[PDB]
Amino acid sequence: GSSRCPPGQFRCSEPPGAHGECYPQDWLCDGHPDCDDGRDEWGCGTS
Known part of the structure; x- marks a missing residue:
């Protein structure tokens, strides 16, 4: 399986690539x- 490991070094205001495999972006x-307010899961929460 490919070695997943997307970018994720922001300030917690926009998930570039979720993949706990590398970065905690998974959060x-x-x-x-x-996050600051809570947009890391904005377009995720709502089904």
């Missing part, structure tokens, strides 16, 4: 927001 778009 983003998961279920609950954990």
